[PDB]
Design a protein around this ligand. Structure first.
Ligand SMILES: O=c1cc[nH]c(=O)[nH]1
Ligand code: SF4
Length: 206
């Protein structure tokens, strides 16, 4: 089922990342440039999970390198968290996208629950490998990947969650995806940014 047979029996992140380059666990590997595995080391206490690599990440081979990543770095710095000490990854490892005539970018398309479930074996391997004390779930797709398809990020802000089917029973904190804070009225973006910093500080205080 899904990516399971493509996941080797190793906690070495470099070996896992190389194996993910060969994954065919769903259809998304076909049009994407490459798999984008997580970045960071196994000593990380905090794991952060986004939805999927976007246009820039698909070509950089690294997560959170575009505008959403720059806002996330501003929030991490405000929360006094060193990005270099985190393990940062995504629920889905291949960019799902389309282009619009006249567009300046490839446009993300939402992964189906089917694709998230197919890719989840990689997240389980990452979590088993890193043994984080806390997992920050950035956005609906990531949070639902671990907390259920009905989970609503908007309803659980600031909350330390724990579920029974997650490796090592880490604390889970679900928050807004940084891409949500890039657009909207200034006051709304500023309030939302403060809330993201708050949630990052809850996770770091675990
Ligand atoms: O790595 C990335 C970049 C943008 N958005 C995500 O969810 N993940
Ligand atoms: S998105 Fe995940 S499950 Fe699908 S092919 Fe890529 S690595 Fe495999």
């Amino acid at each position: 089922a899904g990516a399971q047979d493509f996941v080797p029996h190793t906690a070495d992140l470099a070996e896992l990342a190389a194996a993910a380059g060969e994954c065919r666990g769903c259809g998304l590997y076909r049009d994407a440039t490459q798999a984008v595995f997580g970045a960071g080391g196994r000593s990380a206490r905090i794991m952060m999970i986004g939805e999927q690599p976007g246009d820039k990440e698909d070509l950089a081979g690294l997560p959170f390198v575009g505008p959403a990543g720059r806002l996330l770095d501003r929030a991490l710095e405000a929360a006094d968290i060193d990005r270099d000490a985190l393990y940062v990854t995504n629920a889905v490892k291949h960019f799902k996208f389309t282009r619009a005539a006249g567009g300046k970018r490839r446009i993300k398309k939402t992964p189906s629950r089917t694709e998230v479930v197919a890719c989840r074996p990689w997240l389980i391997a990452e979590m088993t490998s890193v043994e984080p004390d806390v997992v920050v779930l950035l956005g609906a797709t990531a949070a639902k990947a671990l907390l259920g398809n009905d989970f609503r990020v908007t309803q659980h802000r600031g909350e330390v969650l724990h579920v029974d089917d997650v490796p090592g029973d880490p604390a889970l904190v679900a928050t807004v995806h940084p891409s949500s804070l890039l657009r909207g009225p200034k006051e709304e973006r500023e309030s939302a940014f403060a809330g993201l910093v708050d949630d990052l500080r809850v996770a770091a205080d675990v």
